[PDB]
Ligand binder design. Sequence first.
Ligand code: ECH
Length: 324
Amino acid sequence: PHMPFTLASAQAIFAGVAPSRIPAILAEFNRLSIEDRLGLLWFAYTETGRSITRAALGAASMSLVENLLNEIKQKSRAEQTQVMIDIASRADTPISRSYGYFSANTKLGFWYQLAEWMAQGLVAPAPKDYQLSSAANDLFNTIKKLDGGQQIQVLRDIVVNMGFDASVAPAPAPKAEEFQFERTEPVVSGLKVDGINDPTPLAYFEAMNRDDFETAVNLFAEDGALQPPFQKPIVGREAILKYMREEAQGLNMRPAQGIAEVLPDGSKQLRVTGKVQTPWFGVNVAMNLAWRFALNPDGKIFFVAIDMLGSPEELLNLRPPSYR
Ligand SMILES: CC1=C(/C=C/C(C)=C/C=C/C(C)=C/C=C/C=C(C)/C=C/C=C(C)/C=C/C2=C(C)C(=O)CCC2(C)C)C(C)(C)CCC1
């Protein structure tokens, strides 16, 4: 009584989340000292900071970054050093709580602008000067082996999980942290995805590529879910649309091959792969992704998982029975 999908059985399609070195890297990072973490972030960012899109965030998000960074700027070098520690360790402090309330791209923008100020000498370069442990230097080496997309996904996971959240069920973020980006490249040309004819996943890509989230969210079942890489599923159309507006806007998605299986009741499981650009890096970083779709018999998306991949070989279709 495989059908219909539940969230669990949907999560399990095509052997579940694509295998990755990222979880072990994040777990190892989280066991380091706070100084080792900040120092490693300085070096990790020194690889990738050149290719970051300058001036990416919109006005309202930039105002939040700049207000908080102002409060930081007029602290002493010692207090500034301590504030980076408080945020990075998710300490209960006013500034760490303020950071905790930021949507994800506002958090990334905060550190971007801080890193610029650290270069103007407007803020203490304490991360630059931290003495890394062997464990930290070993982890650095491991990270440098990841592909470009994997490296920025590690940075992102680390940055967005910083700050203190005082509430177990916080409010949705302000409507001004929505639609943060303005596109630079033309919308991706009408997709041919070798192996995928089903109109649902093709409409999904078409809508997301032109920021048409009203279309995209209406492709979901009422109780449908969207699972971002190494994140919990976002469930129902209200939550999914809010998330799409906050975090899935301005992406260029180039799925190019995939496969389907039809279940006896007409449900369908699909796994599509290809390359995606984030407005944070533009054409500079092509992330290798897989989308795993579970469709109900009416063609609605019950579930879509987005898995971060690491290699060209992971783009190919998986091989039953184990889906390797
Ligand atoms: C901290 C720190 C520092 C500064 C760090 C800085 C400055 C880091 C900046 C990092 C940035 C900017 C990273 C951005 C990463 C963005 C990524 C990896 C985006 C991936 C997006 C994906 C994969 C989306 C795919 C999706 C698809 C395809 C769907 O179909 C549905 C939606 C969605 C799931 C969204 C300094 C140096 C001061 C030292 C002290 C500590």
